[PDB]
Design a protein around this ligand. Structure first.
Ligand SMILES: *[C@@H]1O[C@H](CO)[C@@H](O[C@@H]2O[C@H](CO)[C@@H](O[C@@H]3O[C@H](CO)[C@@H](O)[C@H](O[C@H]4O[C@H](CO)[C@@H](O)[C@H](O)[C@@H]4O[C@H]4O[C@H](CO)[C@@H](O)[C@H](O)[C@H]4NC(C)=O)[C@@H]3O)[C@H](O)[C@H]2NC(C)=O)[C@H](O)[C@H]1NC(C)=O
Length: 277
């Protein structure tokens, strides 16, 4: 009777667009606790709203207050994207600035942190909290490097936000979310055959209503494992559950037995469902 393990992750993805249409929001931000997203905010609606299972959780976060400082961040974000675009003279062109910012804890202790920006998919700038300093990866990023380090203090706060302000927020959220994130829901599995007129028969094995997401689902033909013709995976965020299915194509003659094997953490011994033809 064996391992420790309690690692939890808090991540934000920020997205801006230089050229956007009326209905499409210019700025957007969402935050995830582990693999599940707990809140979104955009520049159109201009309101911080909780998402998924976190709609029923009260008093974890002052959403009105959060909207405020989200707005603050939106300003600094787009202003940066403007500066990149203005620098490349491509004022009229559809460009993307994406920002990833986050920390994580393992066994109650800070174990890692990251703060990185991307431009049109390419590495733009990055915080090295060891120095501490920002690290340009793009010629344009030299300007931002100078702005964000204008005062020597700024670099010290950036280190503080990652190393302390973030994990502090994480733990706070964890008081309300530990129960959610720690779930070990087993999958119900369902086998289904289907025939297309001028097509080989296809056997679908669906695993559903499970969490966490890490799952092995594979077919076997008369003992040997078969490579799937197609595999599908889904996260139902409102539900806070996962769904995953695998389809194999069985030749017209084939009389050999097919069974679906599901392996998930919430199960002691593996789950096997045979296709009762
Ligand atoms: C969280 O949310 C998700 C999505 O919002 C919910 O998904 C639903 O899950 C329930 C079970 O909790 C499913 O109920 C059905 O149960 C019977 C067994 O008693 C099964 O026969 C069903 O199996 C599905 O999949 C089969 C093969 O893949 C398919 O042949 C079958 O038709 C059925 O769903 C299919 O049919 C429906 C009806 O038209 C289609 O709408 C659906 O797209 C289709 N699915 C697929 C890809 O095959 C099935 O499990 C519901 O089917 C399922 N529905 C949805 C909208 O996803 C989930 O229930 C919920 N969980 C919790 C814990 O709250």
């Amino acid at each position: 009777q064996e391992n420790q393990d309690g690692r939890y992750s808090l991540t934000y993805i920020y997205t801006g667009l230089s050229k956007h249409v009326e209905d499409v929001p210019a700025f957007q931000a969402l935050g995830s606790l582990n693999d599940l997203q707990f809140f979104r905010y955009n520049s159109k609606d201009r309101k911080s709203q909780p998402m998924g299972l976190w709609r029923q959780v009260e008093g974890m976060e002052d959403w009105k207050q959060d909207s405020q400082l989200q707005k603050a961040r939106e300003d600094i974000f787009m202003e940066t994207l403007k500066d990149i675009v203005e620098y490349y003279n491509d004022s009229n062109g559809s460009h993307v600035l994406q920002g990833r910012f986050g920390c994580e804890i393992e066994n109650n202790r800070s174990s890692g942190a990251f703060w990185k920006y991307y431009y049109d998919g390419k590495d733009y700038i990055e915080f090295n909290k060891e120095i501490p300093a920002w690290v340009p990866f793009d010629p344009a990023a030299q300007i931002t490097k100078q702005k964000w380090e204008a005062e020597p203090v700024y670099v010290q706060r950036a280190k503080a936000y990652l190393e302390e302000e973030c994990p502090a927020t994480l733990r706070k959220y964890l008081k309300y979310s530990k129960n959610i994130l720690d779930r070990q829901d087993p999958p119900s599995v369902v086998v289904t055959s289907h025939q297309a007129p001028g097509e080989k028969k296809k056997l679908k094995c669906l695993a559903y209503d499970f969490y966490p997401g890490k799952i092995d689902v594979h077919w076997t033909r008369a003992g040997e494992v078969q490579e799937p013709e197609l595999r599908g995976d889904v996260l139902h965020n409102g539900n806070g559950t996962y769904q995953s299915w695998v389809v194999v194509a069985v030749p017209p003659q084939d009389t050999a037995p097919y069974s679906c094997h599901v392996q998930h953490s919430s199960l002691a011994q593996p789950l096997v469902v045979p296709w009762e033809a």
